[PDB]
Design a binder for this molecule. Structure first.
Ligand SMILES: Cc1cc(C)n2cc(CSc3nc(-c4ccccc4)cn3C)nc2n1
Ligand SMILES: [Mg+2]
Ligand SMILES: [Zn+2]
Length: 315
C-alpha cells in the first residue's frame, strides 16, 4: 500500500478541480491517500516531509479509521481537502509549521471514532470519559495521532528542531480539540465580537488559535458546502451513525434526543434547517468576515439552506 502511493500521480483533470472549495473527493476513493500527498506537497512543498515516512504515516492513519457510517477515512480526507483550499486561498497568513500541522490534524482529527458522541461516553461512564473528562473523543483522537507518529518510520516531524516539534504538536492538539462542537459556540461568539470591535489581530497568539479553531469547524462541517446531492447523501451517513447510537440508548431504557431517534426521521429536513441556521451559517459567516477568500463556503451553505427550505414545503 505504502510503496504504491510513493509512485502515485494525480490525474491532470483533478489538478484544476482540487483547488475549488466545492470539490467532492467522493468518486475517487482509490486516489484519497495520493490526493492528501498532493495537497501536502502543493501547500508545504515536495521537500519537507520524507516521502517514505509520509506515505507510511498516511496508510497507518487510514487503517486507524473505523468502518463507521460518517466519522471514517472518507470524512478525514474531506476535512483535509477543505483546509487545503482555505490555506491555498490565504497561504501567506499562516506559517510553514501551521500548514504542516493543520493538514495532518484535519487528516487525524477523528482517528478511531467509534460512532459514539462525547455525551454517550460521559452519561454511560465509558473508560475514555474517565481518561478524558471534557472533549472526550477529541483528546483520544490527539492521543491516537501521537501514537502513530511514534511508530517505526512514521515520525514525519523527525527533521524538526525539538522546539518546532513541540510547536507543531501544540498546533495539532489545539486544532483537534477545537473540533469539539461544544467548544465552537463560545469560540465563534468571541471571534465575532473581536471582528466587530476591530480588536481581532492575527499576530496575537490566542486570537490566532481561535481563528484556527473556527477553520477546523469550517472544515469539519464542509459537507454542507458541497453540491446539494452530495450534501443530501452525506446527511444519510450522519443520521445512520446518530440513529445507531439512539438504538443503544433505547436498549438501556434511555429515550435519545430526537436527532438520534430513527422513529423521528420524518423531522430530518427541519433538523438540517435548524443546524444550518444555528451552527453552519454563523460558522462560514464569521469565517468569511475574518478570511474573505473563504466566501464560496458561505455561498454553497446558503444554496443548501434554501434547498432544505424547498424540501420542507414538498419540493
Ligand atoms: C455536516 C454535519 C455535521 C454535524 C455535526 N451535523 C449534525 C447534524 C444533525 S442536524 C439535526 N437534525 C436534527 C433532527 C431532529 C429530529 C429529527 C431528525 C433530525 C436536529 N439537529 C440539530 N447534521 C450535521 N451535519
Ligand atoms: Mg469529531
Ligand atoms: Zn470530523
Amino acid at each position: 500500500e505504502w510503496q504504491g502511493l510513493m509512485q502515485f500521480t494525480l490525474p491532470v483533470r483533478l489538478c484544476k478541480e482540487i483547488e475549488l472549495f466545492h470539490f467532492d473527493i467522493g468518486p475517487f476513493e482509490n486516489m484519497w491517500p495520493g490526493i492528501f500527498v498532493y495537497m501536502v506537497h502543493r501547500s508545504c512543498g515536495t521537500s519537507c516531509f520524507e516521502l517514505e515516512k509520509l506515505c507510511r504515516f498516511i496508510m497507518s492513519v487510514k487503517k486507524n479509521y473505523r468502518r463507521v457510517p460518517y466519522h471514517n477515512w472518507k470524512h478525514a480526507v474531506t476535512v483535509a481537502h477543505c483546509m487545503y483550499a482555505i490555506l491555498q486561498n490565504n497561504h501567506t497568513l499562516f506559517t510553514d509549521l501551521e500548514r504542516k500541522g493543520l493538514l495532518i490534524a484535519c487528516l487525524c482529527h477523528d482517528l478511531d471514532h467509534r460512532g459514539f458522541s462525547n455525551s454517550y461516553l460521559q452519561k454511560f461512564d465509558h473508560p475514555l470519559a474517565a481518561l478524558y473528562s471534557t472533549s472526550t473523543m477529541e483528546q483520544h483522537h490527539f492521543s491516537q495521532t501521537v501514537s502513530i507518529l511514534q511508530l517505526e518510520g512514521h515520525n514525519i516531524f523527525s527533521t524538526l528542531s525539538s522546539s518546532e516539534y513541540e510547536q507543531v504538536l501544540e498546533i495539532i492538539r489545539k486544532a483537534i480539540i477545537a473540533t469539539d462542537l461544544a467548544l465552537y459556540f463560545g469560540n465563534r461568539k468571541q471571534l465575532e465580537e473581536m471582528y466587530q470591535t476591530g480588536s481581532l489581530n492575527l499576530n496575537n497568539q490566542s486570537h490566532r488559535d481561535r481563528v484556527i479553531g473556527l477553520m477546523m469547524t469550517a472544515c469539519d462541517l464542509c459537507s454542507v458546502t458541497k453540491l446539494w446531492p452530495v450534501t443530501k447523501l452525506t446527511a444519510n451517513d450522519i443520521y445512520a451513525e446518530f440513529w445507531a447510537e439512539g438504538d443503544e440508548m433505547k436498549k438501556l431504557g434511555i429515550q435519545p434526543i430526537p436527532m438520534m431517534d430513527r422513529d423521528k426521521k420524518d423531522e430530518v429536513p427541519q433538523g438540517q434547517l435548524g443546524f444550518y441556521n444555528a451552527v453552519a451559517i454563523p460558522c462560514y459567516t464569521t469565517l468569511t468576515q475574518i478570511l474573505p477568500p473563504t466566501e464560496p463556503l458561505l455561498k454553497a451553505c446558503r444554496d443548501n439552506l434554501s434547498q432544505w427550505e424547498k424540501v420542507i414545503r414538498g419540493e
